[PDB]
Amino acid sequence: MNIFEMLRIDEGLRLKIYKDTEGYYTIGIGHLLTKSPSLNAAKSELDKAIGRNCNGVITKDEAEKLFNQDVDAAVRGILRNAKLKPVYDSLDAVRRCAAINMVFQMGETGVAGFTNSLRMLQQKRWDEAAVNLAKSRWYNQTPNRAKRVITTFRTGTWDAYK
Ligand SMILES: Cc1ccccc1C
Ligand SMILES: [Cl-]
């Protein structure tokens, strides 16, 4: 297992514009297009991202390239952020994947509310961090996804994905 396989399981793959759990236009392996309610705005963002007139549909190769870019961007966001980088660097490779997963789903700004969880993770207080992570809108709105990610932080294994 690696971060790409983990996120492919959590996000799925769809080659036509769809709506995510919050109702936002998305395509591919969880690539957010726009938060605007306008399908035309989403189609424009898609064409800009792919570099051709897609009319709302992409190929598997295009979805996989967008996905590589999106994972890269999540990692770079962590490494540039003075609050997140020290916690990330303290983690083992499996737990680092759980961290990237959260940033991919919620962004840097969405993880800003997790300051207390981050401190517990940096201190390697895994059970305590798991409880704190679950006291969140994230866990209540996407509980199965959150349980898999939290279990990865708690155990440092891939057991939730196996
Ligand atoms: C979201 C995030 C980022 C970096 C380290 C740990 C965590 C939970
Ligand atoms: Cl879920």
Side-chain angles (χ1 to χ4, degrees):
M1 288 275 310
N2 59 57
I3 183 57
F4 294 97
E5 295 176 356
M6 184 196 207
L7 278 166
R8 171 67 172 80
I9 290 164
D10 285 332
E11 299 288 342
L13 170 69
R14 295 182 75 168
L15 300 181
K16 310 176 184 301
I17 294 172
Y18 65 102
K19 289 178 178 183
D20 77 0
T21 63
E22 303 286 337
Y24 298 136
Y25 292 121
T26 305
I27 200 161
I29 305 162
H31 181 83
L32 174 65
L33 289 165
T34 180
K35 293 179 181 179
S36 169
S38 169
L39 180 59
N40 281 341
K43 285 181 169 185
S44 184
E45 288 298 306
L46 181 61
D47 289 354
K48 177 164 57 82
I50 303 296
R52 69 182 178 83
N53 193 325
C54 296
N55 197 31
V57 175
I58 62 175
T59 70
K60 186 169 178 293
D61 290 338
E62 287 168 342
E64 287 168 351
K65 187 170 183 181
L66 275 184
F67 182 46
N68 202 143
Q69 292 174 354
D70 287 347
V71 172
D72 188 293
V75 172
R76 286 195 187 265
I78 293 167
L79 297 177
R80 286 198 231 94
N81 187 302
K83 276 198 54 178
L84 299 181
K85 184 184 188 296
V87 186
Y88 183 81
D89 282 351
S90 78
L91 295 172
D92 57 275
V94 178
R95 294 186 171 94
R96 282 177 183 169
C97 289
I100 299 165
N101 194 308
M102 291 185 74
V103 171
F104 188 101
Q105 184 180 3
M106 290 179 282
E108 288 183 65
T109 63
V111 304
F114 288 86
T115 305
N116 298 329
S117 309
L118 292 171
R119 182 183 63 255
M120 298 176 193
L121 290 168
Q122 193 181 18
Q123 293 175 330
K124 304 193 179 296
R125 292 161 65 194
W126 308 125
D127 281 4
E128 298 94 330
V131 175
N132 189 261
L133 284 162
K135 294 180 187 175
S136 62
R137 182 184 184 273
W138 173 56
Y139 180 88
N140 286 103
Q141 298 299 130
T142 53
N144 285 330
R145 166 78 166 268
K147 289 170 185 183
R148 289 194 292 276
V149 174
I150 293 170
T151 295
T152 307
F153 274 128
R154 185 178 53 90
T155 67
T157 73
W158 291 112
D159 287 352
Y161 289 85
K162 301 310 225 166

